[PDB]
Write a protein that binds this ligand. Structure first.
Ligand code: TYR
Ligand code: TYR
Ligand code: TYR
Ligand code: TYR
Ligand code: MN
Ligand code: MN
Ligand code: MN
Ligand code: MN
Lengths: 346, 346, 346, 346
């Protein structure tokens, strides 16, 4: 026969199934309680029942777990300190999607050297998330595929579907069966309709393909996710100001979905310049003081150290998108806490 | 000890692995030969080694195998008759992605009644593709997820990644290991950079998660797909005309990827009107007559009977997007054949 | 770094999982009814609620399914005719365990030429069992390992654990979770304790290692099989006469298990002389006339044609142990039917 | 559709696949060398190329790994002390086969409380075996089924098939693909032919059903095991003396298999009284000092503290068959080393 199968495949390696990771790193009672509780709390924010600000804040991507747990220990103090004004949740993204050839994230390539030790990667990803939850810091992440969630979704209190996948039917179907609340980002060029469309789609029951905990191909029948919302992350032009929030909210009401939204201070809203995250946060603060009824959260890309680097030389310094440092982070959260205390008190 | 896992999952059900369907419906010598040959012949059009026009043509979605087989028998005659000018490959899409609630396609819901007998669907799909190839008709389809291809990619001569997934990293990774040439559509609002980037991305080696033929979770390390191209399919504005082809070509050369492209006569370029497909085809024909050096194919939604219908009452009429009928198909193909006969003789 | 794993293994090949066979050959409504009620009917014989005689009768091993179906259609007329006196179930054994190099049975080597096409054999075995049941003929078999049952046990009305495996803990555990009544044979040298112990063991809950329907290693927690009994099949000397029955009954009563047993007319009771099966059946008929309260069934090795052959040249003639032909079978059943008519009438 | 499938199954639970354990506890360089060499050294005894006595000695069953490690540390000193005369390998059996309801072993029930935590049991079993090998004590075990060996056979230098399974075709097939040398015991009533038949059978190639390292059902094709021998373990009467050895040797040569055998000092050769293990060993000693040409090994049930316990209330005390203590073990080994010194020196 002429060959027709796997013509462009170098290798297919079997993967340790989720149950193997679950046996080594079973979720503890206290992590279980933190996740259940934070999921519910976030849901209240999504549907306008509590007026705290959800703050998803942390590195662009995790490239070292030691630095991440160190970051978490500082953030934990602010989480407790601002607990009446803000619901702080740590951003634990293992990979930034990239068009150009480059590092594929911590799950994919934990040794940062192109050896793609994914079993170790997933094991590390789960270990980190259990430790964070065990210390009192809830975690959030981006789900890029339909398989990785079986390894650690049980430890995630909030999920994101990125700008590049919000329109994708299979990612919407995934979101409809995710145990956590989910935010959908507007398209890379500013299209908001696709995120509005996605919350619609994700609240309904769907079927997609994936694997069981034991690692076998299966059909997943989901119940719908009622806790979805939009994230404004800019486009050609930023979309974070009051007028864009207003238009967005009107559109969400017309589609019959939640008009409470998140604003990303990073990415195309900061123009890929980390020193502008603070500008976006200040405008949001202004919005919260005047009115700001439709804002329920913000996203901030933050690290121990500011900026970015191509190689992982410097500890707690991003190797993907540039972040603000810890000093600026304390400044940003004091401000948001300050502004939302006034909103909550009106 | 609060629950955190599969909170919004109604059911998970095991799927028959690929090997079960490969065991019952193994590829034949003839089907292997046709797939292999057709994939090569198409790559030749992609890289400009041959100036025949690839015509991806057939129903919007397959909802009846008998009608598809009948359609194929008619198309076969014209595939042979035009074989020196056109490379005709049947469209065999099992689903049409959509945002609203509705029929999820032949793989997901073969009984067209909401039972989701996916084991049956996947079986019928492979059976139809094996039959089409055995009769002399090569097939093409859209790959919407990372698992379904293990079940029938071996029977597919050309693959599409739709507008909604072209920017998705995991779909680009998938394309990088598909055995067939792959077309990337421009975004739903007419964005071409995502498809140009996708070609660049898919030519490189990647890892993604999927399942082995035996249905177990796995790491797939791909080789890169050197045979990818863009498909112009409209957006806010149609992009089929000479001026758009030339803008696209310029952008492709500047990214250092192939400047040969496909034009979808349907969907947003026809504005969802099936009678405008013939208009787009004539415009393409006129370009091939004048120059048209960057056009390597077209896409046409065609069935035995023209139009569309909500319920599958009429034999051979679409229940998804509207199609041209057999009569206009004959004329479209005869038009494109003659226009390309001239381009070829230059 | 020395190799320590799989030193003496030539190949490990993956099987189609049971779900693959179950999907091609699902159990029909009618086959389900037959299996359900025959298991119940037999259970009534084991615990003494009904005085009909279970007759397990058919070839030593199946090597041709067509002969087995032709055998089955003749036997069916007799199953119907003697249904008030005899409960006739066909023997569908796929393999005779042996010590010397030879044919490994219809599952292991369905093509009978040493190519070990196990996927094909499991398929053929299931199809044969399905067709038998669909025609009205219940089936029985011997379970030699802990994995093959997942492929066809749903089609089996009565099971044997052979003389060579009755003492094996893992086989006793299997029996404890088999859906059918099970007969255990006495040891090759005549030891009855191992079968009495086996019945005891198998009535309890156990755990044993096996495979799920999807083919994954699993732990099976069984509930106990309350329907087990012994089979007197001879030893150094035959054990079929009234004295031996009576000694067995007492021992059975002493271990507090059912004192109804089965007598195998073949094997070491006939001493591998198929013409003696008739004399064993005549002894049993006499016991039934006189009393025989502890007999609930008999086993008989029977085919279309008598004797045995080394190669499968002659149609419907055994390639394992020698069987009685069809004419002698008619006599034997008539003999047993008439005798038990009088036992039942008392 | 009446139910016919799994009627008497309480629960099917997925088991961690072997690879999961092999990932947490990979074999080390040193353990590899110890396993590889010992297997070769045993092969040499089996085939008469060295006259050292193989000594399989250790607890009847392991129920505490701390005690097993302490026992091993003491045994190691003797292993080295007597290395020129004896090859001391540790008995590391996890379960003892039972007809009556009892503790089902360390693998099945590591917590000694009916929780059947088999994943943990298998993990513990592997861990113990890896530790033993790491400190320089090779290990030996009974293989009771066709799945457990995938989890630790790589750490085993000698395997036993017990009296209850020696006649079993599937265990013979298992043995034919085991990396270690294998001993087959004579039947529980003293039948030697089954063990002689077993060696014959196990030296040829076989197919049996099992699971891959990845935990999926598979067809195993073995190469044959050339290193099998019998074990004399008594029956209705003891079989350990010169005249039973002589007669066994004769039947062995006559069947064209190795006439070197092992004698079990325990079980039916001791009358199930641990105090008579020594009297058996004294007889073997006398045989060696006169001739003892056919003896290549002995088997001894020994522990730190002598005797049995109904429940595990004491350190280093058997909870299954009764074992001689350390004192009696020092004396037995001295006796054997001394007698065998004399055999080796002529
Ligand atoms: N386990 C995920 C949902 C999920 C289920 C099955 C899958 O295959 C994938 C994802 C959660 O609890 O959110
Ligand atoms: N088998 C596909 C490539 C592929 C391989 C593995 C997967 O999991 C998915 C897709 C092809 O030949 O095109
Ligand atoms: N399926 C078997 C019982 C069984 C279940 C699991 C196994 O792994 C083996 C046997 C029956 O219906 O009798
Ligand atoms: N792994 C075993 C042999 C074996 C192989 C496969 C199995 O499924 C079972 C046992 C050994 O090395 O001795
Ligand atoms: Mn980022
Ligand atoms: Mn369409
Ligand atoms: Mn027989
Ligand atoms: Mn013992």
């Amino acid at each position: 026969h002429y060959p027709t199968d796997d013509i462009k495949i170098k290798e297919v390696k079997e993967l340790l199934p989720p149950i193997a990771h679950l046996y080594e790193l079973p979720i503890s009672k206290e992590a279980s309680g933190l996740v259940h509780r934070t999921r519910q709390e976030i849901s209240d924010l999504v549907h306008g029942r509590d007026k705290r600000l959800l703050v998803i804040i942390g590195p662009c991507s995790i490239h070292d777990p030691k630095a991440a747990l160190e970051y978490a220990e500082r953030l934990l103090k602010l989480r407790k300190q601002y607990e009446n004004e803000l619901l702080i949740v740590m951003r634990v993204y293992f990979e930034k999607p990239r068009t150009t050839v480059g590092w594929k994230g911590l799950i994919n390539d934990p040794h940062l050297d192109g050896t793609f030790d994914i079993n170790f990667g997933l094991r590390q990803a789960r270990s980190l998330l259990l430790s964070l939850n065990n210390m009192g810091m809830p975690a959030s992440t981006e789900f890029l595929d339909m398989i990785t969630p079986q390894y650690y979704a049980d430890l995630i209190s909030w999920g994101a579907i990125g700008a590049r996948t919000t329109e994708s039917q299979v990612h919407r179907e995934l979101a409809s069966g995710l145990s956590c609340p989910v935010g959908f980002k507007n398209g890379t060029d500013g299209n908001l309709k696709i995120a509005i469309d996605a919350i619609g789609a994700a609240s309904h029951s769907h079927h997609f393909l994936s694997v069981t905990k034991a690692g076998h191909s299966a059909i997943v029948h989901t119940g719908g996710n009622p806790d979805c919302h939009v994230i404004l992350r800019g486009g050609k032009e930023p979309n974070y100001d009051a007028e864009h929030v207003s238009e967005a909210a009107e559109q969400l009401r017309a589609a019959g979905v939640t008009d409470k939204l998140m604003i990303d201070c990073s990415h195309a809203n900061s123009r890929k310049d980390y020193t502008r995250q603070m500008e976006v946060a200040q405008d949001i603060a202004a919005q919260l003081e005047q009115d700001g009824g439709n804002i329920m959260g913000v996203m901030v890309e933050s690290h121990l150290v500011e900026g970015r680097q191509d190689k992982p030389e410097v500890y707690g310094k991003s190797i993907t998108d540039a972040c603000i440092g810890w000093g600026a982070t304390e400044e940003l959260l004091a401000l948001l806490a300050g502004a939302n205390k006034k909103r909550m008190a009106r």
